[PDB]
Design a protein around this ligand. Structure first.
Ligand SMILES: N[C@@H](Cc1ccccc1)C(=O)O
Ligand SMILES: [Mn+2]
Ligand SMILES: [Mn+2]
Lengths: 346, 344
């Protein structure tokens, strides 16, 4: 009986329940998470005229830099509360390079998931603890069981939007899920994802106790489409009109990613994409409910030098971000477009 | 308190892989058949054998009886063309034999996994290797020991999760090109699955653990059409070959799906066009995939639960009949026999 010939070995893994006790969620963290979901829900369903903003680092590899950023974003968040509902990007990784905070939390090319999950959860607690909601990519069917309670928003990356596995997973998450369009630039797959995630599914996951079980979902009605470019960009009126053209009756507000395929090989293009999105918003576009910005403390990205995490401070080690000030503007300018759009509807 | 699982209606007890593997044990024959299939598949996709790897069979199995009759027929034909073709049966698992084993929206996974495994044992038991789609990251743990070939479908080839899974399977894995007709994603999948990965899967005992893979060097690309159009023609094969990196394995061409272009009657055609590239010396094509069954076409699921279903007819994709299949395979058989001459 030939089995596991390509499996070098298994390693003990702390269960979700165990991790949730080790690194408990403060009452604030749990309240922050609930609030974020409520606000996000109202915005993508049309009940609120504010714009949902998922902004923050491409990926977090430094909890101390992520905390400084959170404080800054929490303040700005306080000044633009009337127009913008801001959620922080607390992403673990990118698509060859650094494997992410869960796999390689030490950023030294060593794998250590147990410590990774600890960092991941501690991070989420630290952030939501200061009152700042967070969003992350739903990488797999197990990992969310360690962090789902502190998350207000979940995104299903372009490479997995067609994955039956990720559609079933979304149908059972306790928060809004954004499905990015295909890497080939089409929306059909993201529209189908939302339809599917709305139904009830029966899949196999692990319980809070680390055991495999047959899960049964309720269906998620808070799934929307995210426009992020592809084989070209799609944040322009002509493209948005084609998108709207594809959403079924009742579909939720579109979200737009200023990066990746939309800034096509350059973070400097994020502010430009903001103008082209702010325009449509001020002129009265109601289908654009949310935006996604990859910003950091200091612009650009970088690589890991000979040594590990000691590396330019506040600088992404994956996709390049825009600096902070460039972010202050981009958001104040988006808040304006929100107000100006508030009038056109009156 | 907190607010998790608000969309989780509930969990259900699930027999562990180890438990299932004892309940429905694999006969020595089943285990030998599985090993043989992998060896033959490996030799063919790596260039060591001039035969053509053939993954043929139903689009999906919903009837173990009908699947067994078909297996016997295919086993007898497989015995005859064993000199030119290495046949592995399509035994892919409406959600599937696993989610709805009874076919009536009553999702009984435990029974589904039993049927799934019993089926795999029944088939491999008569000496016929089998192949299936690597659905999720847990399911295989209940059937790997019986599988000779695993395919990742178009909608998952880009999934990091499925690339890591392939890197730890004990058999060759075929990655289908994107639903948009491109091969870049399938080529990247093969590159990725060749490396070692660290993911979370469940053990034979139903517990979550950190898995570490060795890397799989037996991953190839499957051409199955797409938006950009069908791709079984020589110019497509050629453009494909030009994109294959150093050390890639032999290409496989799916006759149905995006290449049959919504009409199963086009499979015999793709064959001919592909059989011609082979009979003239094309060695880049080492495998073919065919959605076949006892009776051509497909159907739906009547209010009459399931016992009101046409026998030997697919309840998913349309397939060609046994009759029409035995040709395709005989022509393909010959196309190979020819190739060996052109290379002689
Ligand atoms: N046991 C599988 C590998 C595997 C391990 C863990 C999870 C899923 C699959 C095989 O022999 O191919
Ligand atoms: Mn990024
Ligand atoms: Mn099919």
């Amino acid at each position: 009986a030939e089995e596991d010939v390509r499996i070098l070995g298994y390693d003990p893994l702390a269960s979700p329940a165990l991790l949730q006790v080790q690194i408990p969620a403060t009452p604030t963290s749990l309240e922050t998470a609930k609030r974020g979901r409520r606000e996000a829900i109202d915005i993508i369903t049309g009940k609120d005229d504010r714009v949902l903003v998922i902004v923050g680092p491409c990926s977090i590899h430094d909890l101390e830099a992520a905390q400084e950023y959170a404080l800054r974003l929490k303040k700005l968040s306080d000044e633009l509360k009337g127009d913008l509902s801001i959620i922080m990007r607390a992403y673990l990784e990118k698509p060859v390079g650094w494997k992410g905070l869960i796999n390689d939390p030490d950023v030294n090319n060593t794998f250590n998931i147990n410590k990774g999950l600890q960092s991941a959860r501690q991070l989420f607690v630290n952030l939501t603890n200061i009152g700042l909601p967070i969003g992350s990519e739903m990488l797999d069917t197990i990992s969310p069981q360690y962090l789902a309670d502190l998350v207000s928003f979940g995104a299903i990356g372009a490479r997995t939007t067609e994955s039956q596995l990720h559609r079933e997973l979304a149908s059972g998450l306790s928060f809004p899920v954004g499905f990015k369009n295909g890497t080939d630039g089409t929306l059909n797959v993201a529209v189908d994802a939302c339809q599917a995630a709305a139904h009830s599914h029966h899949f196999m996951s692990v319980t809070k106790h680390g055991v495999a079980a047959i899960t049964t979902t309720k269906g998620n009605e808070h799934c929307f489409v995210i426009l992020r470019g592809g084989k070209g960009t799609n944040y322009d009126a002509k493209s948005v009109a084609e998108a709207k053209a594809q959403l079924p009756a009742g579909s939720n507000g579109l979200m737009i990613d200023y990066s990746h395929g939309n800034s096509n090989k350059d973070f400097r293009n994020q502010p430009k994409v903001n103008d082209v999105v702010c325009e449509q918003i001020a002129n009265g576009e109601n289908a654009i409910t949310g935006v996604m910005i990859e910003s950091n403390i200091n612009e650009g990205n970088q690589g890991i030098p000979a040594e590990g995490k000691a590396l330019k401070y506040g600088v992404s080690i994956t996709d390049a971000c825009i600096g902070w000030e460039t972010t202050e503007d981009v958001l104040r300018k988006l808040a304006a477009a929100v107000r100006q759009r508030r009038e056109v509807n009156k």
